[PDB]
Design a protein around this ligand. Structure first.
Ligand SMILES: Cc1cc(C(=O)NC2CCCC2)[nH]n1
Ligand SMILES: [Mg+2]
Lengths: 410, 410
C-alpha cells in the first residue's frame, strides 16, 4: 500500500466561501445558522438553517454553464476548483490518466427537480429543460470537473446519505493506495434547502424548531437538543500519493492513514442506542491505520444534535477507547455549521486536517448543560489548543451506513 | 490480492421477474418493450419502454414496508434477496461483519420525488411523506438490505449514471480482493419511467420515438436506429472471496478477474466518436486481468441504440482488439431489454456470467441493416453457441464515466 497525503482543500460552508474564512469562524465559535431568506418558510415549523451566503458562481463558470447545473453541483465544483488551485497540481498529457474525481451528494438535485416539476405540472413534458437529467444527477460534479480539467483517471460518485463525504474521501484514498490513481479530488456537496428538503425532514420531525434562537438550535450532547439543523455547502480535498507529492515539491497538510466502514444493520433512520456500528467502524479505521486507540488525540464527531445519535456516539467512543476516552478531545463542528448532510464528512475532514495543522480542537458551542453520560472532553464553548498527532472524523447516515477517516501529522 | 467469484444472481427485467425467466427471453430473442400502461403519455414524444410486469413486492416485504419505498428501492431489494437466496449464503454472528452491500442507481427515487413535489405544490408541505427522504435516496437499497439480512460489512452506493451497475460490481470486487470484505451484494436498480424521466430524456431527444413499433425501437448498430429505449429493473450479484466460497461448498458461476474505470473528459452526455475513453477503460480492465486481448471471446456492449454511442463502441473495440475484433462476438442485450440506466451494467454483468455458464453469445435483435463500419460479429437476430472462456461487459455514462468488467470461466 502507497501512502496518501492531502495537498489541497476547498470549501463552501455557512461560515465562509473558502477554507480559511470557514476555519476563522470555527476557531471563533461563530454560528453560520440564520433565518433562511431565499424562500418563504412562514408556514414551516423550521425557518432557519446554514445557507451559503454571497456565492458568486461566475467566479467558477460562465452563466451558460451555471444555468445547466443544480446548486449542489455548482457548490461541488466551487470546492473542487479551490482544492485543485490550493494543491498547485499541473494537469498534463503525461499525468491526466492518473488524476480522478470522487465527489458525491446525499440527496442531489432537489431544487432542479422542483423547478422542472413546476413546468411539468402546469405545461406538460415539452417545457422540461434538455439539460434536466445531466444538470441534476449526482455524478455530474465528478463529470463536469473531469471535462473542465481534462481528468481521465477513475471518475465516480458515492451517495451514502450523511456519510457521503467521508466515504468519497476514504474510497479515493484506496484508489491511490492500491495504485489505480496518483491524485484524486474527493468530497461532497449538498443543497437540500428547498420545500422538499425542509418539508421532508420536517415531516419526519428530524429538525430543530428553535426558530426564536437559530444560533442556539444546534447543541450536540446538550440536554435541550431537539434535532439537527439543515445546512448547505461543499468540501473537496486533493488526495495524492506521497512520492508524487514530494516529487513536485507539494505543500502537504497531513497524512490519511486510515479508513473504516460498517453497517449498523439496525434501522432506516435511528442509530442503535449503544453505537455498536460506529464502534466497529472506528475500530476498522484504527486497524487500517495500524494504530492503538491510545494514539487518537482528537475526534471530529458526527454530533448532529439529535437525542439518540449524540448519546450513541458517546457510547461508541467509550467502547472503542476505554479509559483513553477521558484523554482524547471530541467536538462537533455541527454546533456552528449545522448538518451539511452529504457534504458534512468533507468539510469535517478539512476541519480535522486543520486541527492537526494548528494543534487546536474546535469547540462544541451551545453545550450549556451536557446530557446524562455525556461526560467526555467535548471542548464546550471555546477552542482548546492541545497536542494532536492523530485526528479521527466520524460520519453516520440513514440505512446505518458508517464511515471513519484517520488523519495524522506528516 | 484475493480472487473474487460469483456465487449468486438476482434480477428484475422487462423480460422476467428473475434470472432464469429473463435469460430464457434473452436466448429466444424476445423483446421486453411495450407501450407504457402505468401512466398517460399522450403528451410525450415517446410512449413505450421496458416495464417490469407483474412485480409482487409482497414476496419480499409487507405492503406497509413497501408503501414507504420508491419502486427503484423495491426492485433493488427484490434482486438482492434473490441473489443472496441463489448463493446459499447463511448470515451468522460469525460472518455478518464480513458481508457488505453496494447497490446503486443512476437517478434513484425520481417517481417518489415527483409525487412528493405534486403534493407540496398542490396541497402544501404537510402532505410531504414523513418517509420521503429514507424512501427516496439511492443508498437505501444497501441500507434496507443490510437491515433485512443483518449485513454489517461495508455499506455504500455508487451513482455514476448509466455506468452505476458496472462500477458497483467492480468496486465491491475490489473490497473483497483487498480484504475489506469476504462477501458483497453488488449491482443496481432503476425506475425512471415517470413524467420527469420520459420528459427529461425526451427534452434531450435521447429516446427512440418509434411509437408505432416499440419492439423494433431498440436496434443497436442498425442504420435506422433513433435513440435508446428507457427500461426499469434491477440486477444483484453475490461476489465472494474464492476460499470463503470453497469452504462452504458454494456453486461458483464464474470468476471476476478484471475491472476498468476511465473518464472521457470529453462531453457531459455525448461520447467521443473514436471511443478513446471506452478503449482506455477496456485496456485498464484487460491489464488488470493480466490478459492478452485475444483471450476475449464475448463482449456484452453498452450498445444503447444511439447514433454516436453505437459507432464509438465499434471504434473502441477495433482500437483495443485490432484484427481479433473480427474473431470475438459482441452483442447488445439492450436490443431486447432496452436501457436499464443504472441497473444496465448489473443485468448485463449477469448476462455475461450466463454466456460463460451456457457457452452462448446472446443476440442483437433488430440488427436488420448494420450501419457503415459496423462490420464485426454482432450476433444479429439469433443466439450463437460458441467457446467463451473470457467475457467483457462495458458501460459508458453521462459525465464521460466508463466501466469494464472482465469475467472468466472458473
Ligand atoms: C474563491 C474562488 C476560486 C475560484 C476559482 O477556482 N476560479 C475558477 C476559474 C475557472 C475555474 C476555476 N474562483 N473564486
Ligand atoms: Mg426490443
Amino acid at each position: 500500500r502507497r501512502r496518501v497525503v492531502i495537498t489541497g482543500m476547498g470549501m463552501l460552508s455557512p461560515l465562509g466561501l473558502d477554507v480559511p474564512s470557514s476555519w476563522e469562524g470555527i476557531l471563533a465559535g461563530r454560528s453560520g445558522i440564520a433565518p433562511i431568506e431565499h424562500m418563504d418558510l412562514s408556514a414551516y415549523s423550521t425557518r432557519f438553517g446554514g445557507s451559503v451566503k454571497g456565492f458568486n458562481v461566475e467566479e467558477y463558470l460562465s452563466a451558460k454553464e451555471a444555468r445547466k447545473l443544480d446548486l449542489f453541483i455548482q457548490y461541488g465544483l466551487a470546492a473542487s476548483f479551490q482544492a485543485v488551485r490550493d494543491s498547485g497540481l499541473e494537469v498534463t498529457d503525461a499525468n491526466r490518466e492518473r488524476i480522478g474525481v470522487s465527489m458525491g451528494s446525499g440527496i442531489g438535485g432537489l431544487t432542479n427537480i422542483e423547478n422542472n416539476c413546476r413546468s411539468l405540472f402546469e405545461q406538460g413534458p415539452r417545457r422540461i429543460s434538455p439539460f434536466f437529467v445531466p444538470g441534476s444527477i449526482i455524478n455530474m460534479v465528478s463529470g463536469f470537473l473531469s471535462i473542465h480539467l481534462g481528468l481521465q483517471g477513475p471518475n465516480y460518485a458515492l451517495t451514502t446519505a450523511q456519510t457521503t463525504g467521508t466515504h468519497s474521501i476514504g474510497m479515493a484514498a484506496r484508489n491511490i493506495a492500491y495504485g489505480e490513481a496518483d491524485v484524486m479530488v474527493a468530497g461532497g456537496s449538498e443543497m437540500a434547502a428547498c420545500g422538499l428538503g425542509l418539508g421532508g425532514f420536517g415531516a419526519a420531525r428530524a429538525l430543530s424548531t428553535r426558530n426564536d434562537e437559530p444560533t442556539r438550535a444546534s447543541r450536540p450532547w446538550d440536554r435541550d437538543r431537539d434535532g439537527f439543523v439543515l445546512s448547505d455547502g461543499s468540501g473537496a480535498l486533493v488526495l495524492e500519493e506521497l512520492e508524487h507529492a514530494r516529487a513536485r515539491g507539494a505543500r502537504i497538510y497531513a497524512e490519511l492513514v486510515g479508513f473504516g466502514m460498517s453497517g449498523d444493520a439496525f434501522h432506516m433512520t435511528a442509530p442503535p442506542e449503544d453505537g455498536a456500528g460506529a464502534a466497529r467502524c472506528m475500530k476498522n479505521a484504527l486497524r487500517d491505520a495500524g494504530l492503538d486507540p491510545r494514539q487518537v488525540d482528537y475526534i471530529n464527531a458526527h454530533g448532529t444534535s439529535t437525542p439518540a445519535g449524540d448519546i450513541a456516539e458517546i457510547a461508541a467512543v467509550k467502547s472503542v477507547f476505554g479509559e483513553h476516552a477521558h484523554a482524547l478531545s471530541m467536538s462537533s463542528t455541527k454546533s456552528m455549521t449545522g448538518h451539511l448532510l452529504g457534504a458534512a464528512g468533507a468539510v469535517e475532514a478539512i476541519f480535522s486536517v486543520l486541527a492537526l495543522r494548528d494543534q487546536v480542537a474546535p469547540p462544541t458551542i451551545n453545550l450549556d448543560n451536557p446530557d446524562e453520560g455525556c461526560d467526555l472532553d467535548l471542548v464546550a464553548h471555546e477552542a482548546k489548543p492541545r497536542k494532536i498527532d492523530v485526528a479521527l472524523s466520524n460520519s453516520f447516515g440513514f440505512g446505518g451506513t458508517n464511515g471513519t477517516l484517520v488523519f495524522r501529522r506528516f
